[PDB]
Amino acid sequence: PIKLARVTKVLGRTGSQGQCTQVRVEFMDDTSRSIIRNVKGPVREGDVLTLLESEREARRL
Amino acid sequence: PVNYYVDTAVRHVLLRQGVLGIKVKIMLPWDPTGKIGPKKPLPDHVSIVEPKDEILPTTPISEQK
Amino acid sequence: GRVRTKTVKKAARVIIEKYYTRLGNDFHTNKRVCEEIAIIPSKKLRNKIAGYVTHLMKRIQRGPVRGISIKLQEEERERRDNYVPEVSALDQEIIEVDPDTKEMLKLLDFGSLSNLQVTQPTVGMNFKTPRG
Amino acid sequence: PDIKLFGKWSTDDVQINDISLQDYIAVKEKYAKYLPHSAGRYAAKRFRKAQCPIVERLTNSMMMHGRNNGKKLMTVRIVKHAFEIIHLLTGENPLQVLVNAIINSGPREDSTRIGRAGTVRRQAVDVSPLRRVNQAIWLLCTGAREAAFRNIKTIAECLADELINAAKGSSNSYAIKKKDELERVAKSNR
RNA sequence: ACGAGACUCUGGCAUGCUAACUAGUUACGCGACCCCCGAGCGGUCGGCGUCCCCCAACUUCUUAGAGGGACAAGUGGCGUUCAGCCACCCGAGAUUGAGCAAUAACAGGUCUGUGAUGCCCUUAGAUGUCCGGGGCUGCACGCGCGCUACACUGACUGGCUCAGCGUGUGCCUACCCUACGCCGGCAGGCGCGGGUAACCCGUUGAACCCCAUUCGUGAUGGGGAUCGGGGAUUGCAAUUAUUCCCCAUGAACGAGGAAUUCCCAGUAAGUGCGGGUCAUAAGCUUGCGUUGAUUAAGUCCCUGCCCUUUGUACACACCGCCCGU
Ligand SMILES: [Mg+2]
Ligand SMILES: [Mg+2]
Ligand SMILES: [Mg+2]
Ligand SMILES: [Mg+2]
Ligand SMILES: [Mg+2]
Ligand SMILES: [Mg+2]
Ligand SMILES: [Mg+2]
Ligand SMILES: [Mg+2]
Ligand SMILES: [Mg+2]
Ligand SMILES: [Mg+2]
Ligand SMILES: [Mg+2]
Ligand SMILES: [Mg+2]
Ligand SMILES: [Mg+2]
Ligand SMILES: [Mg+2]
Ligand SMILES: [Mg+2]
Ligand SMILES: [Mg+2]
Ligand SMILES: [Mg+2]
Ligand SMILES: [Mg+2]
Ligand SMILES: [Mg+2]
Ligand SMILES: [Mg+2]
Ligand SMILES: [Mg+2]
Ligand SMILES: [Mg+2]
Ligand SMILES: [Mg+2]
Ligand SMILES: [Mg+2]
Ligand SMILES: [Mg+2]
Ligand SMILES: [Mg+2]
Ligand SMILES: [Mg+2]
Ligand SMILES: [Mg+2]
């Protein structure tokens, strides 16, 4: 299923050239839930991300 | 400040085996008058004056003259 | 970046040292005082010096600064430093001592003190950090 | 007073069905303008182009290629004609069609490359809403541009067809094909 | 202490100051035209007075002088609560763009810029210096900087409507910028005036752009190479076509392999206009405007350059040193 998540805190810049951004995201359906995600493109705190597959987690720096 | 604080001169002298070149640079001193130096100071030189002595007031005194 | 070069900082510190009374927290009054007292051949340099003087004055009002010290501030710190309690903190009606301390006092013919109270020493001798 | 794009397209009835993209599409009351031409300074600061109305963003992105750089009045005319054609074909507000097309065209999961000049390996990542809007507009403009080239068909008609197909969700559009391929590659790079 | 910053020029703000017939505005008179259904304290006027005997005021717009103005100053966060960073209010502006630029070096370029210059060589059958004619451009082929295109977001034919930076009659020195009238279809030719210049060209009627017309995916009315025949200007001289104009001819080219360049806001790109060269003269360069974006507010992956640690049998410094046939 497709899920929506809210960006709580921006963590850092990842990638070979720094193209990706590592952030912390909390699910809308369950406010207790929180994971770490890699986002492509400009992103700031409060943005809403559409997770097609919400089980994957990213290796934080 | 190089334009008005530095005086430059380039000369050539012919010696037996060829030409020698001479370069001379002189940095002028600051002079309030324009006789032997630039009138204006260097841009980054700040001169803060020493405060004068002030008598500490003790009792209100009214002087009429 | 907005880092101030050492020229601005040195001029501001000297101005605050010499004319602390005339300055305040207003940038415009400070910049009017600076041109009165100091010789700055530039308008932008004067504005930078005044803007640092205002920040430094606010910092001084918050508390002491690591750098300059004002004569009035030093004199007031002397008054704050002559603070004296009504009673001495050394005065105690009962002072607890170990038996070895009492023996040391006795060897100096001071075993007749009434303020002394002998406390039981710790039973176990374990005062070292566990090596590992 | 009521402000309508080109004097005839109202903005009150338009509504956005995506919660994520609500903060990055500017079509609503305070972003309602008469024309998609404001000479604004939106590129001065980061994230400031999210306040630019979406019609003006389409107009800006339609000034390609280099033979059409700076010709923004022709682009405004093209957008006006395309909206007229869309209203005639579908019968609904062209602004709603544009919003639906931009929502449907934006990829949701992408793949980031780790490439030694010849061989490339990739890993799946997420796409921020602003990049989704940017890529949707770029894909729509590219599809219209490639459709109009070397063909007896006005650029306005091709743009209208591209927008209608993208809003409908049909695979006949360039943007939907590109989005599907990008998402398939991202899925396979998990 | 030098470099960096500071500094100088430049671009943005001032209805506050100074003051202007080689800049204007407004107002008032005269005049031309339109509406006699509203004729008016009416509209348009880059049409004429209002300084010079007397017949208006004033710098908003134009010029350029003196000063002001912005300092991370105010607020909220994050920071050792420091140095400083992020966001926001107010504000013309919260990072305009250039110039100058240290200690030390390179066998970097320049003797073809110099009456800068040391040594060689030549000097009357000249390597001096003039004159005449050629060459520097010669074409089986490779390599760079560029211009024009491959069209319909186009081409063609009309109509409408907007700039800025600058130059202009020259010691020798011959060669300036051009308004207006007539002739020619055009390149041009005749007259007759202004300007040594905020005075004249000039209100620099620029091009893209805008509004209509024709064409209709056809190497086509896209593209304009290569050629034929005529006409005219500069020159003492145009052939190996100086340049320009007119008919005719109508090539490759349908977006470009490996590889590779430049760029973060009035920027990239599109589009014209000045200056240099210039008797004749821009596909180059150096500047100026006009239309005007996509993307990014990061990193050390590629490339390169700096630091710290570390190893060295290198010091002409890895293009090194060095071993054995
Ligand atoms: Mg077409
Ligand atoms: Mg004025
Ligand atoms: Mg050499
Ligand atoms: Mg030389
Ligand atoms: Mg020589
Ligand atoms: Mg020589
Ligand atoms: Mg030469
Ligand atoms: Mg001869
Ligand atoms: Mg000859
Ligand atoms: Mg040659
Ligand atoms: Mg070159
Ligand atoms: Mg080229
Ligand atoms: Mg060029
Ligand atoms: Mg056109
Ligand atoms: Mg043609
Ligand atoms: Mg025609
Ligand atoms: Mg035309
Ligand atoms: Mg043809
Ligand atoms: Mg043809
Ligand atoms: Mg001929
Ligand atoms: Mg020849
Ligand atoms: Mg022809
Ligand atoms: Mg040019
Ligand atoms: Mg020329
Ligand atoms: Mg050349
Ligand atoms: Mg690197
Ligand atoms: Mg070793
Ligand atoms: Mg060593």
Structure tokens given for A41: 């493109």
Q: What angle do CA B19, B24, B26 make, to 5 degrees?
A: 175
Closest CA to D121 of D30, D190, D24: D190
Q: What is the DSSP letter of D5?
A: B
User: Resolution of this PDB entry, in A?
Assistant: 2.8
Q: B60 beta carbon < 7 A from strand E?
A: no
Query: Could you give the C-alpha distances from B37 to B5, B24, B25, B32, in angstroms and in order?
Result: 8, 17, 15, 8
How far is the C-alpha of D97 from the C-alpha of D14, rounded, in Å? Answer: 9
Chains that touch C (3 or more CB pairs under 8 A): B
How far is the C-alpha of B25 from the C-alpha of B9, rounded, in Å? Answer: 7
The reply to whether residue B49 touches residue C7, judged by beta carbons under 8 angstroms, is no
Q: Which of residues 62-101 of C touch strand E (CB under 7 A)?
A: 62, 66
Size of interface B-C (CB pairs under 8 A): 33
Q: In angstroms, what separates the C-alpha of B52 from chain C's closest C-alpha? A: 10
Structure tokens given for C99: 């038996």
When divided into structural domains, chain D yields a total of 1
Could you tell me if C89 and C46 are in contact, meaning their C-beta atoms sit under 8 angstroms apart? no
DSSP letter string, chain A: --EEEEEEEEEEEESSSS-EEEEEEEESS-TT--EEEEEES---TT-EEEESS-S------
C125 touches chain B (CB under 8 A): no
Chains D and B touch (3+ CB pairs under 8 A): no
Surface-to-core class of residue D42, CB atoms within 10 Å of its CB (0-12 exposed, 13-18 middle, 19+ buried): middle
How far is the C-alpha of C23 from the C-alpha of C38, rounded, in Å? Answer: 13
Q: D168 beta carbon < 7 A from strand E?
A: no
Q: Convert A39-53 to b/e letters by CB count within 10 Å (16 or more is b).
A: bbbbbeeebbbbbbe
How far is the C-alpha of D181 from the C-alpha of D152, rounded, in Å? Answer: 29
Residue C37 belongs to a domain with what CATH number?
A: 1.10.60.20
Question: Which of C21, C31, C39 is the mutation pick for testing B, counting most B CBs within 10 A?
Answer: C39
Residue labelled with tokens 């999961």: D109
C65 touches chain B (CB under 8 A): no
Solving technique for this entry?
cryo-EM
- Residue-range definition of the domain harbouring residue C15: 1-61
Of residues C11, C18, C19, nearest to B46 (C-beta): C11
Chains that touch A (3 or more CB pairs under 8 A): D
Closest CA to D133 of D52, D190, D38, D75: D52
Q: A46 beta carbon < 7 A from strand E?
A: no
Residues in D touching A47 (Cβ below 8 Å): 20, 23, 128-129
How far is the C-alpha of C23 from the C-alpha of C33, rounded, in Å? Answer: 7
Query: Could you give the C-alpha distances from B7 to B1, B28, B30, B33, B47, in angstroms and in order?
Result: 11, 7, 13, 18, 25
Of residues C19, C39, C49, nearest to B47 (C-beta): C39
Could you tell me if A42 and D47 are in contact, meaning their C-beta atoms sit under 8 angstroms apart? yes
Q: C18 beta carbon < 7 A from strand E?
A: no
Structure tokens given for D97: 């069609």
Question: Length of chain C, please?
Answer: 132
Could you tell me if D106 and D18 are in contact, meaning their C-beta atoms sit under 8 angstroms apart? no
Query: Could you give the C-alpha distances from C2 to C45, C113, C121, in angstroms and in order?
Result: 13, 67, 63
- Residue-range definition of the domain harbouring residue D175: 1-190
Question: Which of B48, B49, B54 is the mutation pick for testing C, counting most C CBs within 10 A?
Answer: B48
Could you tell me if C19 and C35 are in contact, meaning their C-beta atoms sit under 8 angstroms apart? no
C49 touches chain B (CB under 8 A): yes
